[PDB]
């Protein structure tokens, strides 16, 4: 219904001039808001310079060159190699294929299975949707075979009766061990994880999880990929989600914040060990047949600028400084009887609605409580995403204290109204 | 690393090249040329990779792209009505397509669109009662680790590529060859079972396969067979779409009507990542009826394309269709072919093939037996590298080299292209002979 022609700062602006505080950041990507002049200028400058090209082995743009160097610098790696795609979905697909390729070139063509978790979200293509752990993909006959889903490390939802958080994590480690032993370590190509699950509902991992599963993965030579599509470039209060949760992956998948939402592109940052193994493999005396993944020079120039903005013009810092206030206000909202929990970190958070708090019982699906909240928020000039029984706050990093208050004021009005109505 | 080359080589996957390539870092272009950091100019006979059909400094398209950023849209995952841009592009696509009506779904690339169409078929067949109708009929083949990046989605069933020169039996006419492939298709449907087949995907002219136009009469022979069965026909126009074969679509050039079209890149003339799935009227209806029944709406399909991409696509479409670029293809194709004919008189050219502004030359060690050079000799690669040394970009594929230059190419630039390619072929073939 609402006609939108542009945005300003963190606001979507309709044709009548109504401003809607966008706590979805567009598509979880507009970290610097909708009309950032530096980013717009960088886009325009690159179109004037060199408006499209495709990267080949031995022939690429200067922008591909500079972005690759920047990305290694700000990665957790001392060295490595980067390639690009058009999206997070294709970056995930292409990393899978690169593992399949590498393992095949190393004499283990059976090493194909991909480990993810239930409630993971990795993309919409057939492979990345198979990696994804959502029930909605059953309508496509997905997942494809060889996409194995581990328990989601969401302690509040999956912890058994009287199971402590430490016990839950020990259980998830057993499960992983046993899945690896059952499948065979030689048949498993890699493990991919969002440090904080994004589209599955903003789900930080149980305490200690990555510390317990990483040694097991390493023991069995299963490559570790961090999917930083949502976490990446500051959303969790460090540059990467994997930093915030102290694990060193073998590669990083990036998109979204990469270009501050201003251009569709993905990137895969290969760490030193995968990089050396791929170099040596490429022994076969040729380039991988059919590998044609490429980004775009405009996307690369915009990404260079997005990185600079985020890291050198205060935006990642604003997330670190305002995260405590953000959580405080959430903690206060979670005192309500119909809020089961708040969860998140840095500038990504969710509130889960419940009909009964002690039992964690949701409202019946048919009441659309999440959606009701989300629609009421929009009536009140706030945009937030309903996911399952939750609503998500993922706002631009440029959010001011006043705008933060505005967000919560609106949201609290929405919650009062909606919870009162469903009570009637 | 200080130098551009060394920066490339140390931080980019694409810089790992160590018949060797050497590293070209490109900064800008002009018409069909690209220019590197050292000032070397190269005629880019691959149009980037197929998509840069208006070249590298087209002012109308640059201005249009810039203008989109100047006023960036309120582009959102779910809030607010579809942008005027996207609605208008969908109308335009339906209009220019072969269909009188249909629906459009958008992606960020030709690859994603392809994949989205597959998923669509899986959804639709499963909704209609046949969740085992999943196989895709395809002509794809490899040239173990060598079939990872190209390998279609699980359940693909392979048909023989209708490349007469390659696959024709000794003394088999082209006509008989097409009749044999029609038998293959019949046999393959009976063996797999029609009820297990989701669709048939075909690039009218096979692109990543080596630029292979189909044998005369192929589509006329296979389409009637596919129509006996409710196997949806998908025209993969990621390369052929918007003029490269001399018509707006590849399926117009080979005179057939698909159920849907996959489009990519060249939608925006390479200026912006986009793909589209254009469903014709039958599949639109079935898709609608499926959604309002099992009642989900399929996740990840979107009728809302990126608004910047959409405005750029509209401009690109108008440039190609109405500012003479598609016509220039049609006008210069005869001359393209005549020169290739001449080049194919060489003993180490087994054939030329192609159509419009997409062509390939295939190298052979012994022409009469169609014997290729030893794979280790990497002859295509050698040719391509030599082209680069001489200011020409062309693309090695298998034992072939491919030309797909921008549509703005003039006759003089075409002569330049061939002049440099002929000198490359002279040098490579002599050095191969000499060793």
Author numbering:
A (entry chain A): 30 to 311, 313 to 454
B (entry chain B): 4 to 21, 26 to 150, 164 to 455
What does the paper say about this structure?
Vfat is an amine:pyruvate transaminase capable of the stereo-selective transamination of arylic chiral amines that is highly suitable for the production of chiral amines due to its strict enantio-selectivity and its broad specificity for chiral amine amino donors. All transaminases use pyridoxal 5ʹ-phosphate (PLP) as a cofactor for catalysis. The overall structure of apo Vfat shows the typical transaminase fold, which is comprised of two major domains, the small domain and the large domain.
In the present study, we report the crystal structure of the PLP free apo Vfat. Interestingly, the two subunits did not contain any cofactor such as PMP or PLP based on the electron density map. As the dimeric form of the current structure might be coincidently formed during crystal packing, we confirmed the stoichiometry of the apo-state of Vfat in solution by multi-angle light scattering (MALS), which measures the absolute molecular mass of the target protein in solution. The theoretical molecular mass of Vfat, including the His-tag was 52.79 kDa, whereas the measured mass was 103.72 kDa (0.89% fitting error), indicating that the apo-state of Vfat also forms a dimer in solution. The structure of the two PLP/PMP bound Vfats differed from our apo Vfat structure in that both of the two cofactor-bound forms (PLP/PMP) of Vfat had structurally stable helices in the α1-α2 region and the α6-α7 region unlike the cofactor free Vfat form whose structure contained a disordered α1-α2 region in subunit A and a disordered α6-α7 in subunit B. The PLP/PMP bound Vfat had four symmetric molecules in the asymmetric unit. Interestingly, however, the two subunits in the apo form of Vfat showed different side chain orientation at K285 despite the backbone folding in the vicinity of the K285 in both subunits being structurally analogous to those of the PLP- and PMP-bound form. After careful analysis of the structure, and by lowering the contours of the Fo-Fc map, we discovered a small volume of electron density around the substrate pocket of subunit A. After several rounds of restrained refinement with Refmac5, we determined the electron density for the small molecule to be around the substrate pocket in subunit A. In addition, a small molecule in the apo state of Cv-ωTA was not found in the substrate pocket.
